[PDB]
Amino acid sequence: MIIGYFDGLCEPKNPGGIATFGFVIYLDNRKIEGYGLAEKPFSINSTNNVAEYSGLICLMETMLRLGISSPIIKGDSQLVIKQMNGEYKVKAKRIIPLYEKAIELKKKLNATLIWVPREENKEADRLSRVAYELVRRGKLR
């Protein structure tokens, strides 16, 4: 069963920090993972939720492009998972287009999205932090 995980962070302030994401895709014999900048650094449009959605979108885009289908996708954002499952409304103007992109991807992938606690999402967390550190080192821009 293909399982992907995503995460996003925004530090050292939220909002107005550096927003990064990370994701990991588990296949039985190999792993593919990704991490990066979600928004322009220190911009007022870097937010935690934008970062989380960006990690989700990049995860599902990567899956789609690789020909993965019917994955299970796990994250530790209750808000994002509940929005993606039709259980919380999306009303924030900057989240709406990201939610829409993610919903189209979820439909195309026949993805199932479930919440797990933070301590079960450590790899994707770690990768969002690696991305953050890389931005601080001028290695992602």
Residue numbers in the entry: 1 to 141
Sentences from the paper on this structure:
Ribonuclease HI from the hyperthermophile Sulfolobus tokodaii (Sto-RNase HI) is a monomeric protein of 149 amino acids. Sto-RNase HI is highly stable, and is stabilized through the C-terminal tail. The C-terminus of Sto-RNase HI is anchored to the core region by one disulfide bond (Cys58-Cys145), several hydrogen bonds, and hydrophobic interactions. The C-terminal residues of Sto-RNase HI contribute to stability through local hydrogen bonds, hydrophobic interactions, and a disulfide bond.
First, we investigated in detail the stabilization effect of the Sto-RNase HI C-terminus, by measuring the stability of a C58/145A variant lacking the disulfide bond, and a ΔC6 variant lacking the six C-terminal residues. The shape of the spectra was almost the same for the wild-type and variant proteins. The crystal structure of ΔC6 Sto-RNase HI was solved at a resolution of 1.66 Å, as shown in Figure 2B. Two molecules are contained per asymmetric unit. The root-mean-square deviations of the Cα atoms for the A and B chains of the ΔC6 variant against the wild-type protein were 0.446 and 0.436Å. C-terminal residues 142 and 143 of ΔC6 Sto-RNase HI were not observed because of disorder, indicating that deletion of the previous C-terminal residues made the new C-terminus flexible. The denaturation temperature is 102°C for the wild-type, 93°C for C58/145A and 78°C for ΔC6 Sto-RNase HI. These results indicated that Sto-RNase HI is a hyperthermostable protein with a denaturation temperature beyond the boiling temperature, and is destabilized by 9°C by elimination of the disulfide bond and by 24°C by C-terminal truncation. In contrast, the ΔC6 variant shifted the curve downward and flattened it. This is the result of decreases in ΔH and ΔCp. Because the C-terminal truncation eliminates hydrogen bonds and hydrophobic interactions, this result suggested that elimination of these forces at the C-terminal region was mainly responsible for the decreases in ΔH and ΔCp, resulting in the destabilization of ΔC6 Sto-RNase HI.
